[PDB]
Design a protein around this ligand. Sequence first.
Ligand code: REV
Ligand code: REV
Ligand code: CA
Ligand code: CA
Ligand code: CA
Ligand code: CA
Lengths: 90, 90
Amino acid sequence: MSELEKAVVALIDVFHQYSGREGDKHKLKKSELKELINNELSHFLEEIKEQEVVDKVMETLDSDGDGECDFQEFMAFVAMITTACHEFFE
Amino acid sequence: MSELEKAVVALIDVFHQYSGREGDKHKLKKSELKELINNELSHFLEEIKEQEVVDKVMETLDSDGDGECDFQEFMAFVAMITTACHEFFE
Ligand SMILES: *c1c(O)c(OC)c(OC)c(O)c1[C@@H](CC)c1ccccc1
Ligand SMILES: *c1c(O)c(OC)c(OC)c(O)c1[C@@H](CC)c1ccccc1
Ligand SMILES: [Ca+2]
Ligand SMILES: [Ca+2]
Ligand SMILES: [Ca+2]
Ligand SMILES: [Ca+2]
């Protein structure tokens, strides 16, 4: 596998890890999203401790309004982060 | 680094590898995009041999119409692939 292919499988993998935990196994509810961010982006994002922040983040990512973050909304999240990092460095 | 963080840095890294080669070092012209797909997605995508395919792919990815693929359009490409892979498996 190339680095890129590895990156794609890792994205799918981490999403699966967190989404399968509770309820809809293909969507991230607030607690799952909070755990993903806290455990997997601890070097990029501030750790979420407040409900207000979990709610704001979910609201921002929840494009279809079903209260959860699906795979597409997750990829939209990944793109926001990756694009911010990219613009940041040059 | 988490798997996810590694994934983000890899995305940025591969884009940088191919974009810096020629012309605008922050954008993928057709030849660069072709080489990225051929060398880095050889297990997910058919190898591109025809100009018609390079042109179709570029056209599809080129949202702002500047003839090249920037980082955002690239992330849109990554999302298409990753989302197709994800839907494919469950
Ligand atoms: C984002 C990425 O991708 C990154 O690469 C490893 C690094 O570290 C070199 C970061 O610090 C970030 C950070 C800040 C630059 C970031 C995360 C989310 C949104 C904007 C920036
Ligand atoms: C997508 C992924 O993630 C994958 O895992 C490595 C494999 O290989 C087992 C694929 O073949 C794909 C395919 C769909 C099955 C794909 C490739 C590019 C774009 C969309 C889907
Ligand atoms: Ca879930
Ligand atoms: Ca949603
Ligand atoms: Ca270039
Ligand atoms: Ca463009």
